Design a protein around this ligand. Sequence first.
Ligand SMILES: Nc1ncnc2c1ncn2[C@@H]1O[C@H](CSCC[C@H](N)C(=O)O)[C@@H](O)[C@H]1O
Ligand SMILES: Nc1ncnc2c1ncn2[C@@H]1O[C@H](CSCC[C@H](N)C(=O)O)[C@@H](O)[C@H]1O
Ligand SMILES: C[n+]1cn([C@@H]2O[C@H](CO)[C@@H](O)[C@H]2O)c2nc(N)[nH]c(=O)c21
Ligand SMILES: C[n+]1cn([C@@H]2O[C@H](CO)[C@@H](O)[C@H]2O)c2nc(N)[nH]c(=O)c21
Lengths: 291, 291
Amino acid sequence: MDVVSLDKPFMYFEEIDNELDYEPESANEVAKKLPYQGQLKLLLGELFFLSKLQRHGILDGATVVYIGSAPGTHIRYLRDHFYNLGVIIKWMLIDGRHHDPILNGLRDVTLVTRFVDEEYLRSIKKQLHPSKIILISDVRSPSTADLLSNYALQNVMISILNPVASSLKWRCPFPDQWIKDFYIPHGNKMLQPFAPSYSAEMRLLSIYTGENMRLTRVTKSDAVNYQKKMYYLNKIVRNKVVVNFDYPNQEYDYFHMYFMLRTVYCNKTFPTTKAKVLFLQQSIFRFLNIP
Amino acid sequence: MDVVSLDKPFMYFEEIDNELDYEPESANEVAKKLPYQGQLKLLLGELFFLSKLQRHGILDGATVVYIGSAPGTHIRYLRDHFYNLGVIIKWMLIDGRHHDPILNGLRDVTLVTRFVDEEYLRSIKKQLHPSKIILISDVRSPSTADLLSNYALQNVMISILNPVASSLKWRCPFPDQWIKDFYIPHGNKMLQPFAPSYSAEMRLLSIYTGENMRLTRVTKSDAVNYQKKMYYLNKIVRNKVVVNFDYPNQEYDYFHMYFMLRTVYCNKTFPTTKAKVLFLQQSIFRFLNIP
Ligand SMILES: Nc1ncnc2c1ncn2[C@@H]1O[C@H](CSCC[C@H](N)C(=O)O)[C@@H](O)[C@H]1O
Ligand SMILES: Nc1ncnc2c1ncn2[C@@H]1O[C@H](CSCC[C@H](N)C(=O)O)[C@@H](O)[C@H]1O
Ligand SMILES: C[n+]1cn([C@@H]2O[C@H](CO)[C@@H](O)[C@H]2O)c2nc(N)[nH]c(=O)c21
Ligand SMILES: C[n+]1cn([C@@H]2O[C@H](CO)[C@@H](O)[C@H]2O)c2nc(N)[nH]c(=O)c21
């Protein structure tokens, strides 16, 4: 077995302290071990993001505009969570596909069947005004050309919507498939537990202060770094069993999940962090129908 | 007469301490008092900008890419100045119109007869590489739609060229002619002496550190501010005679010019700032054929 003692997990991309030469054969390896692993991945990353905003006092009263939200089964848990905690939020879920029916009938959540474009963004901006907007993007067209296209639209979501914060899907294009350098918003590169086995994807978390918007260029060299660091994390790190982690599951992803969940706010008072986390995880797994 | 004692002139937009309701009648008022006032305006603003970069040690060895450079008569003085001081610079002047023949025959200056577009920017970027690039933009298509168009291209010049610094033409669109909010690069809003009488134009000076690019949104309210502050400066301030300014010309613009010129580097050693400035101004006026 691949056992180890870890202090904490890598929470952000910059923390990854090693790299590996990408083995193309890994793409043939089993991408997922858990049922509904994708919603879980999204639910933890989004609970983490939103709890932070709560922590900074910018969640209550905002309208969360989620683009690329369908089916969105996990968004129901996210909504109930903050709704039961008492935070006042309006959810506007927009996608061209259809949303899970469990999202229907909630006065606080509006579902829109529309693929968004720049023109549309301007109309929802005029219709949401003057509410504070929190943006979450998970749109998917893929080719490097498809990616750049998606990232370009995400930057327009921000310029037009002008949110107080944003969570954006972020996977750097492959170096061997470079087309051109581009700019993404500045933010924390949040690592995702339960992402597909060899996924190089993360979520960009940003909070907008003042009336400025800071961007950062992404070059092919960066793409090489992304590939090597994410390859090292997936092949080695995520396959570690943290023996000094006293919890029902000791695999790296549960250790990583633990650290994300310990930052979430709950109503019930627990004697320990372990008790709150166990509670949140059980609740999450039961909701998603994960054994 | 409109006399006054001033400590220093407003060097940046943010410094302007007052505003006035814009009088549309002012547009009918004489826009220029000096022959070749336009080149003078450009020459001071560009000497100011470049001396700063020299001061920060980023001028020597760069290639200055000037877009919207023709005729460019004053660029000859700028080139000779740094060339005689010993700074090593290559000038690449690109415009669709023709350049003043005085710019020909200099091995260090290349003239290009091309209107630039995104695709072209990419080719000059590949051809200039790996030199450090300093960008100066003075392109002019006008309608608010024309402006946004120009500002949009200027932002692309920066993203593609990736200069170490930039000087960009900047005039906010009129509030009563608003179309949409937009982003311009962060920079110092340099005020311009000898600009047309009621001009609301300035130059955005930026130095790029790291691999980031910071932008700032411009709203209609900002457009109202720009209009009022620039109207106050043009109607009142620029019409002041600084009696405590001991110089051959006491008008505000010469006082403003003095402060810009006192930052320029020269070969000759002068006993006073007044002597260096008088020297630089005389030299500039004689070169431009201004009495
Ligand atoms: N311009 C656009 N506007 C809205 N949705 C878009 C889009 N381009 C792609 N999409 C949507 O982005 C989605 C990617 S899958 C998203 C999964 C969802 N976040 C979940 O929680 O289940 C697709 O449903 C696709 O229709
Ligand atoms: N895309 C583009 N590329 C290059 N030049 C452009 C342009 N769009 C407009 N221009 C040029 O921008 C110029 C504006 S006048 C510029 C004056 C010049 N800076 C001087 O020192 O004399 C025009 O000559 C026009 O041809
Ligand atoms: C992380 N990853 C996945 N694939 C490819 O994506 C497919 C779907 O997941 C995989 O089958 C693999 O071919 C990669 N290809 C390259 N060049 N570099 C990578 O980092 C990489
Ligand atoms: C600074 N300025 C000039 N013009 C207009 O531009 C023409 C050419 O210089 C002027 O004749 C005037 O009509 C302005 N119009 C408005 N609404 N607001 C301004 O601040 C302004």
